[PDB]
Design an enzyme around this catalytic site. Sequence first.
Site, PDB file in Angstrom:
ATOM      1  N   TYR A 146       1.028  -1.415   0.532  1.00 41.83           N
ATOM      2  CA  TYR A 146       0.208  -0.415  -0.077  1.00 41.83           C
ATOM      3  C   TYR A 146       1.108   1.336   0.140  1.00 41.83           C
ATOM      4  O   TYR A 146       0.552   2.635  -0.263  1.00 41.83           O
ATOM      5  CB  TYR A 146      -1.455   0.087   1.245  1.00 41.83           C
ATOM      6  CG  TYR A 146      -2.087  -1.265   0.873  1.00 41.83           C
ATOM      7  CD1 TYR A 146      -2.382  -0.876  -1.039  1.00 41.83           C
ATOM      8  CD2 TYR A 146      -2.711  -2.330   1.216  1.00 41.83           C
ATOM      9  CE1 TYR A 146      -3.831  -1.556  -1.361  1.00 41.83           C
ATOM     10  CE2 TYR A 146      -3.824  -2.614   0.489  1.00 41.83           C
ATOM     11  CZ  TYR A 146      -4.217  -2.282  -0.631  1.00 41.83           C
ATOM     12  OH  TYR A 146      -5.254  -3.536  -1.123  1.00 41.83           O
ATOM     13  N   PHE A 148     -11.434  -2.956   9.349  1.00 48.70           N
ATOM     14  CA  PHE A 148     -12.608  -2.405   8.872  1.00 48.70           C
ATOM     15  C   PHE A 148     -11.921  -3.138   7.144  1.00 48.70           C
ATOM     16  O   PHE A 148     -13.082  -3.561   6.369  1.00 48.70           O
ATOM     17  CB  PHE A 148     -13.214  -1.278   8.700  1.00 48.70           C
ATOM     18  CG  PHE A 148     -12.201   0.028   8.495  1.00 48.70           C
ATOM     19  CD1 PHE A 148     -11.986  -0.056   6.605  1.00 48.70           C
ATOM     20  CD2 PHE A 148     -11.387   0.355   9.024  1.00 48.70           C
ATOM     21  CE1 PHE A 148     -10.685   0.416   6.480  1.00 48.70           C
ATOM     22  CE2 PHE A 148     -10.628   1.457   8.871  1.00 48.70           C
ATOM     23  CZ  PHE A 148     -10.599   1.304   7.492  1.00 48.70           C
TER      24      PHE A 148
HETATM   25  C1  LIG Z   1     -19.186  -5.820   1.571  1.00 51.76           C
HETATM   26  O1  LIG Z   1     -18.043  -4.844   2.421  1.00 51.76           O
HETATM   27  C2  LIG Z   1     -17.790  -5.062   3.422  1.00 51.76           C
HETATM   28  C3  LIG Z   1     -16.092  -4.693   3.801  1.00 51.76           C
HETATM   29  C4  LIG Z   1     -15.691  -5.417   4.673  1.00 51.76           C
HETATM   30  C5  LIG Z   1     -15.402  -6.388   5.586  1.00 51.76           C
HETATM   31  C6  LIG Z   1     -15.232  -7.201   6.262  1.00 51.76           C
HETATM   32  C7  LIG Z   1     -14.731  -6.493   7.452  1.00 51.76           C
HETATM   33  N1  LIG Z   1     -14.325  -6.938   8.522  1.00 51.76           N
HETATM   34  C8  LIG Z   1     -13.512  -6.727   9.882  1.00 51.76           C
HETATM   35  C9  LIG Z   1     -15.559  -8.357   9.685  1.00 51.76           C
HETATM   36  C10 LIG Z   1     -13.962  -8.269   5.643  1.00 51.76           C
HETATM   37  O2  LIG Z   1     -13.366  -8.926   7.296  1.00 51.76           O
HETATM   38  C11 LIG Z   1     -12.825  -7.258   5.356  1.00 51.76           C
HETATM   39  C12 LIG Z   1     -11.533  -7.984   4.654  1.00 51.76           C
HETATM   40  C13 LIG Z   1     -12.434  -8.750   3.385  1.00 51.76           C
HETATM   41  C14 LIG Z   1     -13.434  -9.866   4.522  1.00 51.76           C
HETATM   42  C15 LIG Z   1     -14.506  -9.585   4.993  1.00 51.76           C
HETATM   43  C16 LIG Z   1     -17.310  -7.414   4.466  1.00 51.76           C
HETATM   44  C17 LIG Z   1     -17.337  -6.160   3.701  1.00 51.76           C
END
Ligand SMILES: COc1ccc([C@H](CN(C)C)C2(O)CCCCC2)cc1
Lengths: 392, 392, 392, 392
Positions: C119, C392
């Site tokens: 990143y 997130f």
């Molecule tokens: C549909 O948009 C999203 C955004 C983030 C998530 C998850 C958030 N977690 C911290 C619970 C994620 O964990 C983010 C990393 C990739 C896998 C899913 C889900 C949907």
Amino acid sequence: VTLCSPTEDDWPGMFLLAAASFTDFIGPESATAWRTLVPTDGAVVVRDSEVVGMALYMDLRLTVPGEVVLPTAGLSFVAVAPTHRRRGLLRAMCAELHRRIADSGYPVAALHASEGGIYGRFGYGPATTLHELTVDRRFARFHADAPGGGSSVRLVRPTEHRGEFEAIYERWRQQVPGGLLRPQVLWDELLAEAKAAPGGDRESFALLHPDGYALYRVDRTDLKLARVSELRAVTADAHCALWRALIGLDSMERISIITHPQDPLPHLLTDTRLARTTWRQDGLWLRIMNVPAALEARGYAHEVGEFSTVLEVSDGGRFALKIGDGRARCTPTDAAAEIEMDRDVLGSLYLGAHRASTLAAANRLRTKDSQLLRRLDAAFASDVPVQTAFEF
Amino acid sequence: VTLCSPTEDDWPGMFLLAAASFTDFIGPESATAWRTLVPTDGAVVVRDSEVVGMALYMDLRLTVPGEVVLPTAGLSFVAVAPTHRRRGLLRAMCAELHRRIADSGYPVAALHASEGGIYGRFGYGPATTLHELTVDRRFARFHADAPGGGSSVRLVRPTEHRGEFEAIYERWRQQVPGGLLRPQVLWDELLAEAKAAPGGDRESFALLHPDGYALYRVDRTDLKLARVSELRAVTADAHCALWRALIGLDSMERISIITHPQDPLPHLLTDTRLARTTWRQDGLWLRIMNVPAALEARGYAHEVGEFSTVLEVSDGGRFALKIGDGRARCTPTDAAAEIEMDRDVLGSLYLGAHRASTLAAANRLRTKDSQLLRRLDAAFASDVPVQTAFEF
Amino acid sequence: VTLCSPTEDDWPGMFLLAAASFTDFIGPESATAWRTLVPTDGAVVVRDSEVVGMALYMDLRLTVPGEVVLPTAGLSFVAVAPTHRRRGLLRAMCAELHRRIADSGYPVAALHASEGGIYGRFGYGPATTLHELTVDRRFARFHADAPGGGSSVRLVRPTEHRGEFEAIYERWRQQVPGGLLRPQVLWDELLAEAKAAPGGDRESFALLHPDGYALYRVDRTDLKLARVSELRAVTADAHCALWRALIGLDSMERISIITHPQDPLPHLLTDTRLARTTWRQDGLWLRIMNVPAALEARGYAHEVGEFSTVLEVSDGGRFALKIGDGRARCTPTDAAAEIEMDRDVLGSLYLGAHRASTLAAANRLRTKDSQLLRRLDAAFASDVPVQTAFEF
Amino acid sequence: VTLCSPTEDDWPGMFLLAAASFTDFIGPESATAWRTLVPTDGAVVVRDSEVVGMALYMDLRLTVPGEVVLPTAGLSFVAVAPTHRRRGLLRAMCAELHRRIADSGYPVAALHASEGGIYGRFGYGPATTLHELTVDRRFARFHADAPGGGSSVRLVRPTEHRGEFEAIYERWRQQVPGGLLRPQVLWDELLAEAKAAPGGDRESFALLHPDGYALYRVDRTDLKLARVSELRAVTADAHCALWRALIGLDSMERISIITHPQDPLPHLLTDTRLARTTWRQDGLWLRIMNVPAALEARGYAHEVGEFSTVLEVSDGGRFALKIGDGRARCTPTDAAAEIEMDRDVLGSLYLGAHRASTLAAANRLRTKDSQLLRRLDAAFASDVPVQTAFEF
Ligand SMILES: COc1ccc([C@H](CN(C)C)C2(O)CCCCC2)cc1
Ligand SMILES: COc1ccc([C@H](CN(C)C)C2(O)CCCCC2)cc1
Ligand SMILES: COc1ccc([C@H](CN(C)C)C2(O)CCCCC2)cc1
Ligand SMILES: COc1ccc([C@H](CN(C)C)C2(O)CCCCC2)cc1
């Protein structure tokens, strides 16, 4: 393949077989000090020539219940070349040494077993129990009742206090079943192993009390583990004082010792569970060479009333056994057997480490009288718990 | 902070404290089956309201030497909230339940300890010894002497043979010191845990003999390890036949069992060393509530001759103790004490698991007569080795 | 390969890519709750059709030094199919979302990085530091100075106290740099994960104080380890009271928490070393989208006297930067740069987690004035230590 | 038990206690080189006779913020026999040496702590932080910005370049808080440990730059791990050039170093996460012997404006403290305290390793003014990050 007493010329071939057979083999100079304990005609070799088999016994003195000391043949240095397995060499060597041991007048033979499956069939039974206790000394607090709450204990260099160790051990061996006389060559060897080795063991220290001593060294790989190689205590006060000093090794996390199942240590602590049993194995094995001489020689429990029975040892005779006032009389009979067992089972009963009832439950001891079983249990019990002296 | 018998309304607060205190906590429905064994006034809670402390006892029946069955208060479900540590809640809860237990007429209380350092100071002594044996069954061969060389043993589904397990266990509990009556709700619970769980335990199988049963399951993570949860054998033949079947689990490398120190298994094998002691810990703890009622209720060894002494229990009375013909009489006296010990030490002697001589060596038992020590040792010894029934 | 905003029809292809890309992927229903935070035009997909790439941002509120709350684009759900690696899909998706984010008026973007090497080249710098502390709670004693020596803390079920957790977290997020507003769908998700799962996580408990809460659960495999998922404390008293309760979890050996480098916990104990740093990693990454809007929005340290410099961000503009009375003014200039750095370096300075002097020593920040470096260090320092809110 | 300065005759008893207390104890010859740094009257022993306690200090020179060098008493070789624990020997030995140290005119004492729980109560606070970084050098790539993209670095035998190491270290110790003068006997010792040992450490190599050096050796057991024992870099260029050479050890998987929390290494790499923090512990502990002499001797941050306060050290005096233009004046007063702390807390603030705000959050530092806290934080901050020189 012939079987003979070795000549001086055979000893390098024996040391080669030893080196290849025993990872614990210190080397020729150390084995030459153990050789002093081996009598004339105490050794056999099998030649093919080259040495493909060997076995010997050493002259020992073993304490049995009643503080009785028996002459004991200590079998050791037993090896068959990896080239000559399954040729009956062990059987032939054990038969010849047993003939010499019996003819020489030894009532008992003993050994330390490299595996548990070998020696039963030659009439050896496990007679003592090694119990490793590991204490997490960071949590260990002494009970309000524990003795010795100035210290009577000194931290010393073992080599500078040889006389005091010799004298304390002499008192301990005579009063403890399992005790063995330690000859001066074995004090020479013990104090040489105390020294540190480059890439080897760390230096040994001693804790010295008037009535006990503890020899300990930090583990080579685990620097938070102290290993007690030997703790000999003649009084409960000496035992408690030595454990107070060991629990005071504030740079260690753990103290380990190879002790016996009746070690009072756990009961000295407010948390008995801190003295964890981490290892448990057979220690000294006994073969009763002469059943009547062995049974008559030891003391029996005064608590059990006089009783008579007929004991058959499989291929070892049948005897009228009368036990009363702590003494046995054991005489030939052709009366019906009330108890039968193999010779190895008798060795396992002899020092009190195994209960007749336990062996009966495995059918190693056979009787139709449960009352006689309770009487045997009580009579063969040892007042002083059985301990293991030193490996040979 | 007040201390009370809980109302029905308190039970969700107790289940919350339980869940947070006990990782082994199955859940409310399982605990509601153990609740049936808890008498009216068998439970205390401390409220701040919310539940910050609890303790209860269950009505049990405990077999002691002589095949005598005592009413026993089984303390359990003991927890202090992590928010209220060091406020004397445990001390206050134990004092109140002990008052109720003593007033109710229980001669003995018992528990399973989550740590070894807590219960000594409330008068509980460790009274049984858990011994884990692990057998490398790939090397295990039965000795020529071992019984049972058709099989009398069947591989079965536990739930389909409930009646037979109930009947065998009933016979075993009455004849073994440490035995506990198992109420039918506890058979309901046991047979529910036999079922496999998704991401949980694998299915349990049984080996069923007319005179014994073994319940076992493959380990969740180690698929070459079978864990024997329970082996109950009423005869030596049943014990040997069940171990022949367990050693026949050809897809396993190892069989483990939590047993007792006198388990004859090692003696059934040509190599005793194959039955390795891998774990050792205290099992059942006893608090003698009424010294004379407890000492008079158990049987003593017939081998030891009649003897009289004076026993003082620290803050538990002084008694003229006469032991003869396997029976004790224990009456009040102000004569000079010949033996002194804390109440916890008496619990540790009571079922035969610990020797008076061993406790004397730690100064937990005090006497100036070594002869009296040998007599106590012999008299408190149990003919049938002490075993642990089931955790509560 | 085309790049588009997804239609409803694209979402199953996105959930398939997600499942195959993210082991932590709970599943469609959970991701549909995170979808609510994604604005119209917040998502891009690459179709080949089938979904071979995706990326989105969520609408967040991020607290920066001075208790200032910025609208923040939270990049997440970023994946390239294993079939389409090295085709520039990530570069094309990041360029498009950055265009939309900048045009939408966000001064800052943020993400949690799955690897540390990706990143930096898109202008994201690590801005917070995760620090795992593991306490051996068996040795932990509170210092005489520690606050709170009745408990103000209650052990509760999280789902029964949602309101109180919401209110405490709202106060904490506004006063702590790194804080993020937690939307109610994210409280729904958090309280659903509190529940135990068959073959999954164990049940979560809470410790609740008027001014803080701790959410913890026993580890699935290590039953002597409690993992604190979240501790939010608005006062030092709340922080100390919660750690007193956690250290009172007497059935655990160890408590672990993911915290920040300035967590005062070690200083609450007599042995600071008992709070061991077992893990350390980057937490929140920042991309400054608009340099002047970001630099003007945060508060600066009042301790440093007024100073003026010229800051060049590589391909991000050159600015006259004047910092005085805790406020910055940041205006366009073509005067000679006194400080140069890539955009990612500015993100790493922005919340106070990294010192300008540290980045200068690696030549990520370039200046010929050491006095200006000391002034930047002091001015960008945060009074309230920077913490990480939630992933997130 | 008497407490005395040792005579020559006491030293073998001290070496015995040392061997038994310290696993890192090289032996008498090595300790005799450290003895040169011990002044007349720098050592105490407790005799029972035999040596049961000892403690000494060495004459050191410690660099503090502002490049100021203080005479420092380095406490070391502190041991109580495991036979004499809980007899107040440590307390009595520390009180006597502290009396001598204070009377001799040392403004500061310092030590390396074997446990974190001992030294706080004698007024020592942890003042530096050891941070182990382990780099997976197979993935490590230098950032485009990193300096030094012929090599100025040479791979050399340490013993052949003693002069150059001495000169580089002398420059580094004077410019770095935490720096200690290294006496020539300590260069003798360092270069002797460079040599390989049979069953011991492998040979040490050096990387030599005009403005820095790195001493490293392959781990004895892990042959893919190189351990950097010491990296001293006077310039950022020297630091980067040395890490380019270490990352060029193509036969290793991992490079580990014990460094400080502000080591710029992670920022030299495209993936900062590759420089993993694997270990973190207290390094140098400080006891401020004379509060006014210590506070007046160090430099303070020029960024913070002039301010005055009243500081009370618990049992260490109350002082009017005025900090301005990087200088403190610290004079006796009976005016009301605005800041209070124990002596150990002042040692922890003194070199800049711990923030006043962090210690305030644990209530180790007490004030009702948050503005004064921010001013203390800024003023006690060190411009040059604090590092740990060498263990003593
Ligand atoms: C549909 O948009 C999203 C955004 C983030 C998530 C998850 C958030 N977690 C911290 C619970 C994620 O964990 C983010 C990393 C990739 C896998 C899913 C889900 C949907
Ligand atoms: C020459 O006779 C002997 C007898 C025994 C030994 C050794 C005794 N150790 C306990 C030190 C031994 O360890 C016994 C097992 C085989 C290897 C050597 C040596 C020589
Ligand atoms: C409601 O009363 C009780 C009593 C005991 C139990 C459990 C018994 N197990 C052996 C199954 C227990 O395991 C006891 C220790 C604490 C957790 C629960 C349940 C309810
Ligand atoms: C005779 O005085 C001393 C002082 C210190 C030492 C050693 C220094 N090492 C860092 C090499 C020490 O390591 C200090 C801790 C106790 C063991 C010896 C030696 C002699």
